[PDB]
């Protein structure tokens, strides 16, 4: 039989090796050490695994809410988010979790501790704090719900006629949320698209996307050993086929978020602009396995409209910039305190505007605002 | 029976992968994918490596030693006459890439596989360091790594020798005994065990068995209750009454943590200096099909006590981190000798300059004053 | 001397923070630190006591 090479191995470890194991635990690292010797991102995905790659992909989980940070070395807690029941139990920012009930949590990292917190969406828990100010710790009883926290989120820059939007990862919500978003803006006159860091996530979600803004032509294709391969094709309508995009891109950028930066790129629908892509080219499909088990393999390579690949090398921008804050006048004001904060005198939400102050900060957003007002000239020019 | 698992998940792999594969490339994969995920010490030999590590006596090295910490190769020290040595490699650096390549997810021995060769041939390392605020890049030629290990000194104005066992090759118990007969008038021992990496049992226990006459020196266990390797003195050692004192620092492993633990749990030295590496392991090759071979952890080393090394290390009697000695300031003070009407009266040793540049080496003098004073009160 | 490291200055002392003595009763570390002298003299005992536990046998 064709096992036997493999059989001798695993006999001869088990009188052999230093520590009692049983065969069980041989045949669980030997599984988990097969996938991850395949390719790059191939991997095994335990219950423990493939239940948190279920939420991340539904794009919510049952928990508290607080975010913590490790800061300290300990659990302190940076920011709790708006409604979730550990803001309205009144944990805060700076908070250390000593214990949950009786486990030392000052002893360990996040791992257990994150679990212990992220139960399920109904039985309550105790959560046990020191804060830093008070001669006293603090003890909180928290009822559960979901986190329901979303991927893509719409603002407007304050002076001007242009929209940000900033896709973090691609879950099942990305498609309908982007197209809400500019529903809810019929006055604005171009994008800008931050798709910075992104990792990646559903192929679907990226093709999806893809075709807001394009009306012809292919947008992906697969090849593997077998030819059973594929091509995904715009069906024929797009909401927005006509207004400006400059898309923003860098070094962690990687697989689904380099396709639809490739499509675009390829098609000449948009501008690509801040520092070469992480360079990833491939397809995995995800099989479950026994039962809460399951595995993910790479399947497939893809390949942009033109019949270029990206596997090793990563898309380069129209416009390279690395990151900084912008220079400033030399003839400015003596620090005037804006002059006064000039009050004319006889608690808003102003994070739903992009500030002058913040895109000073940013030298690669300021680039891609300059850029859609070169578009806006062009177009001027060409309505005759 | 236990094959169920696997069998389903080799048929996936079969069927459904960007690539044509053969059922022996997915065997070879599942073996290596074993031992890389058992322990950080073992490996897997084909028949071309295992015949090339058969036939091989060595050539050419860089000089530096590694071993894992918390999931990530560490430097444990350079030997001194090295080219690593020379080039500022320390104790504690982690290896980030080995001549443009990365080390996540690498073995203890492809590493030393990669840095291995013959003399002239160049080699690049990038390093992260404590304190820095970005990766070190070191360029290095490799040579044939060649050192005296052993040396005896006198010190200036005292009776005690300082000797410096730099690794454990080959005749250290040799050169350590010439130099002793060399200095019959000696009243103490300074052993300077620190940056020292390791090196062969033989001499470790040969050089313990000098200074101690009866017991156990060290012994191996594994799960198996034959094999259980025990040594003890042969009752033979010149010096039983000799003064000694030990330093070590945390570059010191295995070999040099076996002298050091053996001295103290007989209450035969004093322990001086910061505390070791902590690597108490021995693996062994064993061969699998036809011409193939496995290296596995085999046992642990345990101590007289029956305390183990791995991975606690030995912890000093003395604790003292490096610097330079206090200094005399107050240098114009009153003395019996300045009042007006007083009554009248009636290049081949260790120097002064020397002891001054480190407090380490001071402190094992004054260990070996109080032994010779206390000698003198039970006389 | 001081080692490099000092587990990088942390505040928080490795103080539990859950919630009266006469610790004049004892010498303490930190007064130990900082005089070399008194150290060196604890340091010489320590050797002596390995020599009797050495010698009685």
Redesign the interface.
Known sequence: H??S??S???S??E??????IS??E??T???????????AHSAYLNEKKFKEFQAQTEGEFGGLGITVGMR???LTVIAPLEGTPAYKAGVKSGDNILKINNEST?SMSIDDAINLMRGKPKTPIQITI?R?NE???LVFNIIRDIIKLPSVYVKKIKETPYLYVRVSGFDKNVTKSVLEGLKANPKAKGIVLDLRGNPGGLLNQAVGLSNLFIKEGVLVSQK??NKESLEYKANGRAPYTNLPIAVLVNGGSAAASEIVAGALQDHKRAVIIGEKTFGAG?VA?L?P??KDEA?K?????YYLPSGRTIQAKGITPDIVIYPGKVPENENKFSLKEADLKHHLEQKNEEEKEVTPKMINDDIQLKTAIDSLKTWSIVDEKMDE
């Open positions: 064709m096992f090479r493999f001798n191995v695993v001869e470890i009188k052999k090796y230093v520590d009692k065969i069980s041989i045949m690292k030997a599984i988990e050490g097969l996938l991850s010797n395949l390719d300290d070395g300990v000052l020191v830093k001669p006293k710790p593997g050993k491939s499909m099989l396995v026994n595995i393999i790479t399947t497939a390579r």
